[PDB]
Amino acid sequence: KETAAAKFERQHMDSSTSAASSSNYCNQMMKSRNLTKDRCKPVNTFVHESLADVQAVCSQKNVACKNGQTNCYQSYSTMSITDCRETGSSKYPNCAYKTTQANKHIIVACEGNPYVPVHFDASV
């Protein structure tokens, strides 16, 4: 099956753009990344950085994840991110999202060898 690392890339990485450029970004990306196939995923974050810079976070500041696990890491720098959140008009299969662009630190959970991001925990 798809690996956890690959799933993180598909769900969260967008190195092809520096920022969301229109209100439609989330609608397009949630659909194109297959995140709305079975249900409307309610929230998701895309990161507009190189993959290597995001993978490097696994070597940065160790912190507790929101659920208490201790394999989370916070980026030293802020990163360009886009938050996608379902709107009130969203109704499967026509899932609809609000796009918000921001520059925040990211918190990811890492696993494996090589030790890589597998879960997006939070932005702060």
Active site residue 105: no
- Per annotation, catalytic residue among 20, 29, 119, 121: 119
Contacts of 39 (CB under 8 A, 6+ apart): 92
Q: What angle do CA 89, 18, 75 make, to 5 degrees?
A: 95
Annotated binding residue 70:
no
Annotated binding residue 45:
yes
Write out the DSSP string of 23-59.
Answer: TTHHHHHHHHTTTTSSS--SEEEEE-S-HHHHHGGGG
Dihedrals phi, psi of 84, to nearest 5 degrees = -120, 125
CB 45 within 8 A of CB 12: yes
Active site residue 119: yes
Annotated binding residue 34:
no
Annotated binding residue 62:
no
Annotated binding residue 27:
no
Annotated binding residue 66:
yes
CB 63 within 8 A of CB 71: no
- Per annotation, catalytic residue among 12, 25, 81, 106: 12
Annotated binding residue 85:
yes
Catalytic residue IDs: 12, 119
Annotated binding site: 7, 10, 41-45, 66, 85
**Residues of each annotated binding site for substrate:** 7, 10, 41-45, 66, 85
